[PDB]
Design a protein around this ligand. Structure first.
Ligand SMILES: CCCCCCCCCCCCCCCC
Ligand SMILES: [Ca+2]
Length: 456
């Protein structure tokens, strides 16, 4: 219509998935869906080579603490041998091409840029790098990231900050400011929650358009079908993953309704398919060079979604092998193993400012406890399996191997591989969501369930 394109840049260990709900909100208010673009990049090399400062000097987080512990000391040397000026130049030239293609497609003369966390550091350096690049930017939005620096010269900038306690608040408390920018605060929100919230959407839309949006809801569209564009990619490093995808419509207990899949395809990174609005589906994937069968579950699509992401574990940060000892035990034919994901921190420790606790039940047992999901761990990914493969559910003994992974935690719960698994969430901001799926065995299968990041 009379709108300009918007481009989003994610933070450390992030992807286009943190702007998926915001893209659907922009389209519900009149934007052509294809006007909302995302730029993805390898965050492990960027942090170590370009943002070494933030990494070991708090500007950022505690990944620095868990780099030598996770990445192979040799691999780390290969990464560190890369030229910094070279990495900066080649990555910025790729963003140039994404911006130029959005301008040619829309006829606009400028675009709006949005960054989250480490992505804010990335964008301030990008806009400051040349007059030519800044001349193509109408507005810059910085979400819960950098502070204590000048907004780029001549570009209207908005900075939005969340609850300091949220993560290592060992620094500035409730007083972070970007110089010469409009600065505002949401003290009731955690880190990733601030990026995906409907209140943040209303603030960004008014800053760039001059009026309040008519709605912040994810409005179902008319028609029987929806267009879905997605990608299978490596966690954190974000490179394209190759494999085979089978899609099956399923009933209320997770049983497949058709004999053959409704869609079957060879995927190399990005894929596109037409599906039924409001219908529950199972996305089965087999990745090249692994015999494991993956089953991904989520709520039905109610409108077109051009930003879906399916995360896959790959070197040099193969987080999934942390679970291999148990997958190799004879007991694995008898239990299931699952990963629960939500781009809005799951919190089991009570706090006033935040004002609420989440409850997450698996076969009736709450795994979002004060011990497993404390505020400081900012849990977006929760692993549930039988630690030790001993047939015992010891929920009070922490699973130490995950204490070193960012945004993740784990629960020692025996889930029998017979019949179905029941999963239910009661959100700290109100409302509930539930799933029933088959209890696939861990010796040959992996289960991923993604909860919606906002329930009205
Ligand atoms: C700021 C964004 C945080 C994102 C947290 C994601 C947690 C889930 C990690 C999934 C790792 C790959 C799993 C592959 C399938 C077993
Ligand atoms: Ca156990």
């Amino acid at each position: 219509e009379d709108f300009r394109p918007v481009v989003f840049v994610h933070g450390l260990a992030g992807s286009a998935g943190q702007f998926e709900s915001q893209g659907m909100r922009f389209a519900a208010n009149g934007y052509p869906a294809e006007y909302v673009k995302t730029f993805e990049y390898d965050t492990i090399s960027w942090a170590l080579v370009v943002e070494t400062d933030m990494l070991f000097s708090g500007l950022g987080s505690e990944f620095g603490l868990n780099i030598s512990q996770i990445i192979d000391p040799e691999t780390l040397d290969k990464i560190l041998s890369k030229s910094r000026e070279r990495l900066i130049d080649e990555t910025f030239s790729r963003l140039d091409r994404v911006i130029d293609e959005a301008l040619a497609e829309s006829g606009a003369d400028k675009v709006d840029l949005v960054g989250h966390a480490m992505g804010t550091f990335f964008l301030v350096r990008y806009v400051n790098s040349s007059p030519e690049r800044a001349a193509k930017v109408a507005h810059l939005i910085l979400l819960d990231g950098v502070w204590g620096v000048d907004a780029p010269e001549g570009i209207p900038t908005l900075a939005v900050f969340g609850n300091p306690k949220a993560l290592p608040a060992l620094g500035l408390p409730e007083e972070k400011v970007v110089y010469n920018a409009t600065n505002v605060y949401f003290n009731n929100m955690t880190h990733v929650q601030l990026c995906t919230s409907p209140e943040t959407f209303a603030v960004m839309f008014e800053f760039i358009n001059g009026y309040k949006p008519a709605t912040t809801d994810i409005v179902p569209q008319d028609g029987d079908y929806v267009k879905v564009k997605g990608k299978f990619l490596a966690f954190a490093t974000n490179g394209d993953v190759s494999g085979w995808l089978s899609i099956y419509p399923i009933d209320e207990n997770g049983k497949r309704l058709t004999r053959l899949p409704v869609k079957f395809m060879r995927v190399k990174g990005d894929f596109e398919v037409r599906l039924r609005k409001g219908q529950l589906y199972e996305f089965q994937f087999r990745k090249d060079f692994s015999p494991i069968i993956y089953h991904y579950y989520r709520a039905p699509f109610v409108r077109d979604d051009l930003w879906a992401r399916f995360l896959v574990s790959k070197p040099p940060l193969d987080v999934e092998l942390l679970i291999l000892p148990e997958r190799l035990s004879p007991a694995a034919k008898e239990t299931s193993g699952l990963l629960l994901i939500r781009y809005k921190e799951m919190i089991g420790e009570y706090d006033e400012e935040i004002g609420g606790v989440d409850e997450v039940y698996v076969n009736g047992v709450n795994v979002c406890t004060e011990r497993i999901c404390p505020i400081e761990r900012a849990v977006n990914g929760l692993w549930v399996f039988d630690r030790g493969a001993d047939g015992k559910s010891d929920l009070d003994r922490e699973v130490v191997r995950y204490s070193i992974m960012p945004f993740m935690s784990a629960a020692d719960l025996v889930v029998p591989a017979e019949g179905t698994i029941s999963i239910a969430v009661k959100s700290r901001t109100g409302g509930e969501e539930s799933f029933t799926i088959p209890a696939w065995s861990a010796d040959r299968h992996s289960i991923i369930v993604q909860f919606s990041d906002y329930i009205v």
